[PDB]
Amino acid sequence: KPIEIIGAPFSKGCPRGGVEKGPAALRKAGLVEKLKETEYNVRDHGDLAFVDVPNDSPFQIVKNPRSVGKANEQLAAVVAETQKNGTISVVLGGDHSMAIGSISGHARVHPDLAVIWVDAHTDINTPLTTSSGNLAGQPVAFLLKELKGKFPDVPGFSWVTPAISAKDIVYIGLRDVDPGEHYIIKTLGIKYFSMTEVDKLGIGKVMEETFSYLLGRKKRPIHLSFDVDGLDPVFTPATGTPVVGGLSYREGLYITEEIYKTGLLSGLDIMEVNPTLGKTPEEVTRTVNTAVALTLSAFGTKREGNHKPETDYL
Amino acid sequence: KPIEIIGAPFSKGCPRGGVEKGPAALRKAGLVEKLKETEYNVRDHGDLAFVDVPNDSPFQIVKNPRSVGKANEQLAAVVAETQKNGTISVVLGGDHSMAIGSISGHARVHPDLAVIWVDAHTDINTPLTTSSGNLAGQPVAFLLKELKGKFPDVPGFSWVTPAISAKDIVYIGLRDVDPGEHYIIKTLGIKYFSMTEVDKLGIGKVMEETFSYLLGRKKRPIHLSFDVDGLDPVFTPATGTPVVGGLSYREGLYITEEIYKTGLLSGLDIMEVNPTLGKTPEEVTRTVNTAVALTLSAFGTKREGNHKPETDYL
Amino acid sequence: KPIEIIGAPFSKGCPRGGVEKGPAALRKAGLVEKLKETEYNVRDHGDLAFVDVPNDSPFQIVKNPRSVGKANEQLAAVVAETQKNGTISVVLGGDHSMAIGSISGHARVHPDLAVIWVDAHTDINTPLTTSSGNLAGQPVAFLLKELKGKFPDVPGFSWVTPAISAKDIVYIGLRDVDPGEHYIIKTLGIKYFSMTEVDKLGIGKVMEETFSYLLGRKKRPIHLSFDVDGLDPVFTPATGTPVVGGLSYREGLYITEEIYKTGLLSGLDIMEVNPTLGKTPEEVTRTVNTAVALTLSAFGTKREGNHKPETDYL
Numbered sequence: 001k002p003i004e005i006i007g008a009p010f011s012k013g014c015p016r017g018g019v020e021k022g023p024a025a026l027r028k029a030g031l032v033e034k035l036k037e038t039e040y041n042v043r044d045h046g047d048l049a050f051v052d053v054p055n056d057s058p059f060q061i062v063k064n065p066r067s068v069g070k071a072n073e074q075l076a077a078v079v080a081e082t083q084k085n086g087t088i089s090v091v092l093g094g095d096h097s098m099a100i101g102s103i104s105g106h107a108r109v110h111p112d113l114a115v116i117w118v119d120a121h122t123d124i125n126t127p128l129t130t131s132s133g134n135l136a137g138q139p140v141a142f143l144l145k146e147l148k149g150k151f152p153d154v155p156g157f158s159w160v161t162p163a164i165s166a167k168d169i170v171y172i173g174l175r176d177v178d179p180g181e182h183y184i185i186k187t188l189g190i191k192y193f194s195m196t197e198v199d200k201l202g203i204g205k206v207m208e209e210t211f212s213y214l215l216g217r218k219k220r221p222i223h224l225s226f227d228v229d230g231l232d233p234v235f236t237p238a239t240g241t242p243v244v245g246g247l248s249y250r251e252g253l254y255i256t257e258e259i260y261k262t263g264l265l266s267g268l269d270i271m272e273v274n275p276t277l278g279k280t281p282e283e284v285t286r287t288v289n290t291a292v293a294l295t296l297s298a299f300g301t302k303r304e305g306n307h308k309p310e311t312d313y314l
Numbered sequence: 315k316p317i318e319i320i321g322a323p324f325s326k327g328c329p330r331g332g333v334e335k336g337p338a339a340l341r342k343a344g345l346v347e348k349l350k351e352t353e354y355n356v357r358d359h360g361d362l363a364f365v366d367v368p369n370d371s372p373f374q375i376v377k378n379p380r381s382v383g384k385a386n387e388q389l390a391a392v393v394a395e396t397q398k399n400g401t402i403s404v405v406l407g408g409d410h411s412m413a414i415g416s417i418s419g420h421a422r423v424h425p426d427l428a429v430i431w432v433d434a435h436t437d438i439n440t441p442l443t444t445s446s447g448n449l450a451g452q453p454v455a456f457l458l459k460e461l462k463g464k465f466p467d468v469p470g471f472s473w474v475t476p477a478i479s480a481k482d483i484v485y486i487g488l489r490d491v492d493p494g495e496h497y498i499i500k501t502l503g504i505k506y507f508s509m510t511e512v513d514k515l516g517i518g519k520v521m522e523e524t525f526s527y528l529l530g531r532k533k534r535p536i537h538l539s540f541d542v543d544g545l546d547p548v549f550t551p552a553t554g555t556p557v558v559g560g561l562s563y564r565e566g567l568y569i570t571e572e573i574y575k576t577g578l579l580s581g582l583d584i585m586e587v588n589p590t591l592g593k594t595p596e597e598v599t600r601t602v603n604t605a606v607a608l609t610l611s612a613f614g615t616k617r618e619g620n621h622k623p624e625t626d627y628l
Numbered sequence: 629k630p631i632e633i634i635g636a637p638f639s640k641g642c643p644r645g646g647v648e649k650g651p652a653a654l655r656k657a658g659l660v661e662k663l664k665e666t667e668y669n670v671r672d673h674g675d676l677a678f679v680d681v682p683n684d685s686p687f688q689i690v691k692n693p694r695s696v697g698k699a700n701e702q703l704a705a706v707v708a709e710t711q712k713n714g715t716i717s718v719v720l721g722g723d724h725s726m727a728i729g730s731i732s733g734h735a736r737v738h739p740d741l742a743v744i745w746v747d748a749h750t751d752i753n754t755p756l757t758t759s760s761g762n763l764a765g766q767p768v769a770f771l772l773k774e775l776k777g778k779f780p781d782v783p784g785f786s787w788v789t790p791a792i793s794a795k796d797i798v799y800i801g802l803r804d805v806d807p808g809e810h811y812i813i814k815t816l817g818i819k820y821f822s823m824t825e826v827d828k829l830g831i832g833k834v835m836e837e838t839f840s841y842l843l844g845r846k847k848r849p850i851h852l853s854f855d856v857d858g859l860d861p862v863f864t865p866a867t868g869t870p871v872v873g874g875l876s877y878r879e880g881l882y883i884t885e886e887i888y889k890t891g892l893l894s895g896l897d898i899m900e901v902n903p904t905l906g907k908t909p910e911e912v913t914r915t916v917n918t919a920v921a922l923t924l925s926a927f928g929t930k931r932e933g934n935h936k937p938e939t940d941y942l
């Protein structure tokens with residue numbers, strides 16, 4: 001199978017500059033080379049150049065609407081393109097608002113896809129419920145069919161078409177949900193495993209249930225959108241919104257290993273790695289290294305080890 | 315329901331000064347204000363002023379018997395008072411010996427209560443088995459009916475009446491038990507979940523079983539006495555007796571979330587937070603923040619999020 | 629029962645000097661004295677003096693073959709000796725290549741023994757598959773019957789006789805396996821629990837299954853070879869090859885407590901503690917303390933506590 005890396009060095013979805021450096025840090029750490037050592041064919045599409053929209057006045061509270069909307073329209077085109085040729089898209093993030101274009105483009109080719117969202121946050125604030133106008137905390141609002149027309153149209157997002165329904169998404173790692181977002185997920189009946197369900201069930205049973213929930217009836221392509229703050233700050237400190245009590249390095253790897261095993265991974269996002277937020281170089285190294293490890297895991301690297309087929313090592 | 319915060323800035327139960335500053339550190343962190351944001355009515359009773367008993371000679375090995383006994387008699391009066399008015403008492407600790415007064419006063423109003431003791435220690439040394447005369451390590455000995463008359467009467471504790479039996483207490487987090495204490499809990503048949511049972515069963519099943527054990531027959535008020543050293547030193551380093559290999563931040567929260575869900579929480583103790591034992595300011599901040607988080611969790615704050623009823627956020 | 633401590637201050641099995649100081653650091657921490665407090669009879673055999681083989685040229689890639697082979701022949705003699713007298717051998721390590729002599733000598737007296745290998749590594753590289761000539765990463769290759777004649781005879785190891793088969797060993801904690809090693813364990817059908825199986829099953833079920841697999845048919849002596857890097861670097865940082873995402877302090881203790889409970893522990897290795905690799909004195913202290921705790925746990929120390937029989941503490 002073929003893999004195509006797409007860098008999305010974008011940061012206007014939130015106030016902290018730095019996430020745009022995310023793709024560079026991950027490549028610097030050898031992500032592309034290490035992926036070529038796996039059984040997959042890898043092609044690096046490079047980083048997308050995003051045109052800045054001058055005079056991007058805020059829409060009510062929403063900041064940089066046009067710049068975010070345009071960068072995402074462009075990313076959706078690119079992803080739809082690689083998906084069309086039958087390759088697996090891997091988006092290297094800047095902030096999580098880029099999931100709008102990544103999932104939109106992916107859905108144009110695979111309308112029946114399901115989403116596994118690993119994050120400490122639901123990122124489902126609508127333009128009306130946000131306390132901040134930050135779009136990195138609103139991606140899912142723009143993608144849900146059930147949320148269509150529940151918020152005013154935003155400048156730069158008219159090209160977006162709600163592609164997935166509440167039944168096609170599963171959250172894992174939740175521990176920082178605003179009152180409004182909580183209201184939304186409860187009202188829409190969205191399946192989720194907050195840190196309390198992970199604690200109660202154990203990550204092994206959590207994965208069992210998300211698969212029987214999303215793939216029980218029909219086997220369909222999987223889009224894994226992975227926000228690095230889903231893991232505890234001890235493992236991924238270099239992020240914009242760290243929340244204590246998260247997933248461990250082990251649980252994160254367990255999630256990716258199980259997803260690899262389904263044979264259905266179709267799209268992947270590695271978001272919110274911000275190199276400038278590390279208090280010490282080691283903190284940045286720690287964050288980048290685990291992001292790389294999670295990516296390699298999604299493509300076959302197992303902790304029990306790997307050996308090339310047909311090679312008699314004796 | 316109503317909540318009444320009662321500060322017990324007391325430290326004579328152990329040799330390390332500093333735990334008396336516990337209540338102040340917790341209030342400083344906004345504990346009271348954060349509690350008012352929950353669905354509960356909060357009333358801060360302030361800190362109790364404890365009269366120091368001059369010439370408090372040790373009783374054999376037991377140190378400061380009269381001062382500890384008197385401070386606890388006074389606390390028991392206060393707690394009995396608030397319990398009588400039907401409010402939930404929350405004692406902010408200095409050392410764990412204050413559980414004597416806290417549980418005694420609580421039992422006067424709710425004689426059928428059950429106790430969930432979260433601690434790395436059993437704190438059940440009798441005045442005869444202690445290696446040190448420290449009373450913070452003997453609370454439970456004074457409260458058990460089955461231990462009545464098994465140790466000489468101590469100066470200052472004649473007002474105490476053993477209120478609970480071995481059948482009404484469950485320990486969680488044990489990992490540092492003296493030979494004598496171990497002998498006692500085995501002989502008396504006290505239910506406990508040491509770190510090895512937590513490791514074996516997972517915190518989810520541990521809570522299931524402590525509830526079926528204490529509430530299986532009759533639903534009764536629950537008193538949760540929480541020693542902050544029950545959690546691993548990595549989360550609560552600012553305590554007098556830290557022991558490695560404890561409960562994680564996540565498991566601690568899981569415990570409080572489950573207790574909140576029973577709807578039976580009646581009394582709560584947040585003990586052993588000693589601000590002067592942090593090696594760095596951050597260590598104190600870390601300890602205070604998790605103590606606050608545990609308290610809020612006992613009163614409804616969920617990791618999956620919270621939203622106010624009747625408020626249509628759309 | 630009797631315990632005999634045997635120090636193996638050896639480091640030629642790997643490039644990083646320092647592991648030879650392992651035994652001294654462990655004794656310095658009071659290992660021997662603390663063991664005497666248990667129900668066992670303890671005898672310290674002291675440290676073995678290893679004769680250095682001059683002009684030890686490398687065998688192809690393999691470094692210090694003769695020195696490693698000789699030190700192991702000597703250790704095997706000593707262990708066979710103590711095993712013969714019916715005592716439990718406890719080898720305090722330098723590097724893991726010493727498991728060759730420890731297990732070989734043990735098997736001379738107890739041919740039906742089974743091995744529980746706790747390590748982040750399989751240490752099963754053959755002289756032909758190693759990327760480095762380091763012997764600490766090849767112990768198991770020399771011990772497996774199924775690997776006999778699959779690699780050239782090495783200078784200094786002609787005295788070795790493959791004592792155990794693929795059916796008698798179980799790995800726990802794997803997370804860093806070379807392609808060749810992975811090929812070997814898959815081809816030979818060796819039972820293992822990598823960190824992913826520990827994540828999926830939980831340490832409780834992992835122990836259940838390793839016991840039903842190794843002791844289901846016949847109860848036999850157990851040899852526990854414990855590489856300290858099996859635990860996460862946060863608990864045992866002072867080792868030569870730390871790998872993130874390992875067993876926790878709690879899981880490590882759970883393993884030893886369950887092994888103690890079988891009543892079948894016959895041989896124990898505490899390997900790879902390297903005092904010179906701690907970045908701070910506290911890191912070395914942390915590493916030595918958990919190694920001591922694991923050893924005491926193998927011989928009865930429980931987290932729920934211990935009390936001496938026939939002693940009425942009341």
Ligand SMILES: N[C@@H](CCCCC(O)O)C(=O)O
Binds near residue numbers: 121178
């Ligand atoms: N719920 C917050 C936090 C958003 C952070 C989301 C992150 O995943 O991109 C907000 O809506 O502003």
Ligand SMILES: N[C@@H](CCCCC(O)O)C(=O)O
Binds near residue numbers: 409436437445451492
């Ligand atoms: N078991 C020790 C430790 C007591 C520490 C108890 C703490 O929870 O207050 C002793 O009895 O002195």
Ligand SMILES: N[C@@H](CCCCC(O)O)C(=O)O
Binds near residue numbers: 747758762766809900
């Ligand atoms: N697989 C590596 C790592 C060996 C480290 C083994 C350690 O347990 O002694 C190698 O074979 O060199």
Ligand SMILES: [Mn+2]
Binds near residue numbers: 227229
């Ligand atoms: Mn997030």
Ligand SMILES: [Mn+2]
Binds near residue numbers: 227
């Ligand atoms: Mn996110």
Ligand SMILES: [Mn+2]
Binds near residue numbers: 434435
């Ligand atoms: Mn304690």
Ligand SMILES: [Mn+2]
Binds near residue numbers: 410585586
């Ligand atoms: Mn206590």
Ligand SMILES: [Mn+2]
Binds near residue numbers: 747748855857
């Ligand atoms: Mn190892």
Ligand SMILES: [Mn+2]
Binds near residue numbers: 724747751764
């Ligand atoms: Mn090893």
